[PDB]
Amino acid sequence: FEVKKWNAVALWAWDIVVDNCAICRNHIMDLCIECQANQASATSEECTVAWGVCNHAFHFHCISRWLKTRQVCPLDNREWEFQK
Amino acid sequence: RFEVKKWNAVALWAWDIVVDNCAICRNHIMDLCIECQANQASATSEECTVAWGVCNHAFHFHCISRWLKTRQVCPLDNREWEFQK
Amino acid sequence: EEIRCRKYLHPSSYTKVIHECQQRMVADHLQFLHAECHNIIRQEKKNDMANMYVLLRAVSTGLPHMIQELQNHIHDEGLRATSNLTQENMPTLFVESVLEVHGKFVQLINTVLNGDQHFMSALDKALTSVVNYREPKSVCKAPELLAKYCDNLLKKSAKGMTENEVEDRLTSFITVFKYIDDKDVFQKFYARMLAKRLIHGLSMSMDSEEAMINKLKQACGYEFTSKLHRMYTDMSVSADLNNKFNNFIKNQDTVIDLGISFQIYVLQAGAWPLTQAPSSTFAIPQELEKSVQMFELFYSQHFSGRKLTWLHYLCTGEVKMNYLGKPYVAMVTTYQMAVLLAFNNSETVSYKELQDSTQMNEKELTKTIKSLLDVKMINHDSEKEDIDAESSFSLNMNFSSKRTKFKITTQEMEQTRSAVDEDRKMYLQAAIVRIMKARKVLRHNALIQEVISQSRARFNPSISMIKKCIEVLIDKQYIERSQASADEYSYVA
Amino acid sequence: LTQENMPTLFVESVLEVHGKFVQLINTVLNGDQHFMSALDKALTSVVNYREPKSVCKAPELLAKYCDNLLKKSAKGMTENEVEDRLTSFITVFKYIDDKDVFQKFYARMLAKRLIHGLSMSMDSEEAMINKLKQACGYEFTSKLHRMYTDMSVSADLNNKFNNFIK
Amino acid sequence: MLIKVKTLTGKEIEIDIEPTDKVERIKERVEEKEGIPPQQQRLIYSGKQMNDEKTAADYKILGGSVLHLVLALRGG
Ligand SMILES: [Zn+2]
Ligand SMILES: [Zn+2]
Ligand SMILES: [Zn+2]
Ligand SMILES: [Zn+2]
Ligand SMILES: [Zn+2]
Ligand SMILES: [Zn+2]
Chain B residue at shortest CA distance from C332: B7
User: How many Å separate Cα C228 from the centre of its chain?
Assistant: 17
What is the distance between the alpha carbons of residues C152 and C202, in angstroms, rounded to a whole number?
10
Give the environment of ion ligand 1: residues with CB less than 5 A: A 21, 23-24, 32, 59, 62
Please name the chains neighbouring B, where neighbouring means 3+ C-beta pairs under 8 angstroms: A, C, D
Q: Confirm or reject contact between B64 and chain A (CB < 8 A).
A: no
Taking CB atoms and an 8 Å limit, are C329 and B9 in contact across chains?
A: no
Taking CB atoms and an 8 Å limit, are C222 and D100 in contact across chains?
A: yes
N residues, chain D: 166
Q: Confirm or reject contact between C340 and chain B (CB < 8 A).
A: yes
What is the distance between the alpha carbons of residues C44 and C105, in angstroms, rounded to a whole number?
10
Centre of ligand 2 from the C-alpha of residue A44, in Å: 6
What is the distance between the alpha carbons of residues C146 and D49, in angstroms, rounded to a whole number?
33
Taking CB atoms and an 8 Å limit, are C317 and B8 in contact across chains?
A: yes
Beta-bridge partners for E3? none
Q: Which residues of D touch C218 (CB under 8 A)?
A: 44, 94-97
Q: Experimental method used, please?
A: cryo-EM
CB D139 within 8 A of CB C223: yes
Q: Which residues of D touch C229 (CB under 8 A)?
A: none
Q: Which ligand is nearest to the CA of C270?
A: 3
Q: Is A21 a known ligand-binding residue?
A: yes
Centre of ligand 4 from the C-alpha of residue D146, in Å: 25
What is the distance between the alpha carbons of residues C95 and C93, in angstroms, rounded to a whole number?
6
N residues, chain C: 493
CB C336 within 8 A of CB C318: no
> C130: burial class by Cβ within 10 Å (0-12, 13-18, 19+)?
buried
CB C85 within 8 A of CB C93: yes
| Separation in Å, CA of B19 to nearest CA in chain A | 8
Taking CB atoms and an 8 Å limit, are C106 and D26 in contact across chains?
A: yes
Cross-chain CB nearest to E76 (options C419, C431, C437): C437
DSSP code at position A49:
B
Centre of ligand 1 from the C-alpha of residue A56, in Å: 12
CB C74 within 8 A of CB C105: yes
Give the H or E element holding residue C31: helix C30-42
To 10 degrees, the CA torsion angle through C311, C316, C318, C322?
60
What is the distance between the alpha carbons of residues C74 and C101, in angstroms, rounded to a whole number?
8
Taking CB atoms and an 8 Å limit, are E33 and C87 in contact across chains?
A: yes
Structural resolution in Å: 4.1
User: Which residues, at least 6 apart from C39, have a Cβ–Cβ distance to it below 8 Å?
Assistant: none
Q: CATH assignment of E1-74, given 3.40.50.11540, 3.10.20.90, 3.40.50.720, 3.20.20.80?
A: 3.10.20.90
What is the distance between the alpha carbons of residues B68 and B73, in angstroms, rounded to a whole number?
8
User: Which residues, at least 6 apart from C48, have a Cβ–Cβ distance to it below 8 Å?
Assistant: C40
Q: Amino acid letter at C290?
A: K
CB B54 within 8 A of CB B74: no
Specify the pairing of strand C316-320 against strand B4-8.
antiparallel
Specify the pairing of strand C265-268 against strand B10-15.
parallel
In DSSP notation, D135-153 reads HH-TTTTSHHHHHHHHHHH
What is the distance between the alpha carbons of residues C232 and C237, in angstroms, rounded to a whole number?
9
What is the distance between the alpha carbons of residues D143 and C103, in angstroms, rounded to a whole number?
35
Q: Which of C370, C385, C381 is nearest to C336 (CA)?
A: C370
Beta-bridge partners for C480? C490
Q: Is B57 a known ligand-binding residue?
A: yes
Q: Is A27 a known ligand-binding residue?
A: no
Taking CB atoms and an 8 Å limit, are D142 and B78 in contact across chains?
A: no
Beta-bridge partners for C307? B14
Centre of ligand 5 from the C-alpha of residue B23, in Å: 12
Q: Which of C218, C167, C170 is nearest to D95 (CA)?
A: C218
Chain E residue at shortest CA distance from C458: E35
Taking CB atoms and an 8 Å limit, are B9 and C264 in contact across chains?
A: yes
Centre of ligand 6 from the C-alpha of residue D67, in Å: 29
Centre of ligand 4 from the C-alpha of residue B61, in Å: 7
Q: Which residues of D touch B78 (CB under 8 A)?
A: 146
Decide: helix, strand or coil at residue A31.
Answer: coil
Q: Is A15 a known ligand-binding residue?
A: no
Q: Confirm or reject contact between C230 and chain A (CB < 8 A).
A: yes
Beta-bridge partners for C318? B6, C331
Decide: helix, strand or coil at residue C20.
Answer: helix
CB C423 within 8 A of CB E7: yes
Cross-chain CB nearest to D134 (options C107, C117, C181): C181
Q: What are phi and psi of B38, to 5 degrees?
A: -125, -25
Beta-bridge partners for B14? C307
Give the H or E element holding residue C166: helix C163-177
Cross-chain CB nearest to C270 (options A69, A70, A76): A76
Interface A:C, Cβ pairs < 8 A: 11
Q: Which of D153, D151, D83 is nearest to D118 (CA)?
A: D151
Please name the chains neighbouring D, where neighbouring means 3+ C-beta pairs under 8 angstroms: B, C
What is the distance between the alpha carbons of residues C178 and D136, in angstroms, rounded to a whole number?
8
**Inter-CA distances, C409 with C197, C277, C331, C336, C380, Å:** 16, 21, 10, 12, 19
Q: Is E10 left (phi over 0), alpha (psi -120 to 50) or beta?
A: left
Cross-chain CB nearest to B23 (options A17, A74, A75): A17
Q: Which ligand is nearest to the CA of A41?
A: 2
Q: Which residues of C touch B11 (CB under 8 A)?
A: 264-267, 299, 308-311
CB D112 within 8 A of CB D119: no
Decide: helix, strand or coil at residue D59.
Answer: helix
> C265: burial class by Cβ within 10 Å (0-12, 13-18, 19+)?
buried
Q: Amino acid letter at D14?
A: V
| Separation in Å, CA of B10 to nearest CA in chain D | 29
Beta-bridge partners for C21? none
Q: Which of C74, C62, C53 is nearest to C116 (CA)?
A: C53
User: Which residues, at least 6 apart from C123, have a Cβ–Cβ distance to it below 8 Å?
Assistant: C70, C71, C74, C102, C105, C106, C109
Please name the chains neighbouring A, where neighbouring means 3+ C-beta pairs under 8 angstroms: B, C
Q: Which residues of A touch B23 (CB under 8 A)?
A: 16-17
Which of C412, C415, C418, C426 is the mutation pick for testing E, counting most E CBs within 10 A? C426
CB C214 within 8 A of CB C293: no
Chain C residue at shortest CA distance from B53: C188
Decide: helix, strand or coil at residue C243.
Answer: helix
Domain boundaries of chain E, sorted by first residue: 1-74
Decide: helix, strand or coil at residue C490.
Answer: strand
Decide: helix, strand or coil at residue D25.
Answer: helix
- Name the interface residues of E facing C (CB cutoff 8 Å): 7-9, 11-12, 14, 33-37, 40, 71, 73-74, 76
Centre of ligand 4 from the C-alpha of residue B58, in Å: 8
Q: Is the dihedral of CA A21, A27, A28, A30 positive or negative?
A: negative
Q: Which ligand is nearest to the CA of B75?
A: 6
Decide: helix, strand or coil at residue D118.
Answer: coil
Taking CB atoms and an 8 Å limit, are A74 and B23 in contact across chains?
A: no
| Chains B and A: 3 or more CB pairs within 8 Å of each other | yes
Q: Which residues of B touch D142 (CB under 8 A)?
A: 77, 79
Taking CB atoms and an 8 Å limit, are E34 and C493 in contact across chains?
A: no
User: Which residues, at least 6 apart from D148, have a Cβ–Cβ distance to it below 8 Å?
Assistant: D110, D114, D122, D125, D126, D129
Count CB-CB contacts under 10 A for residue C450: 16
Question: What's the 3-state SS for chain E?
Answer: CCCCCCCCCCCCCCCCCCCCCEHHHHHHHHHHCCCCCHHHCECECCCCECCCCCEHHHCCCCCCCCCCCECCCCCC
Taking CB atoms and an 8 Å limit, are D139 and C110 in contact across chains?
A: no
**Inter-CA distances, C492 with C186, C303, C478, E73, Å:** 53, 79, 6, 13
**Inter-CA distances, C360 with B31, B47, C279, C335, C351, Å:** 18, 16, 8, 9, 12
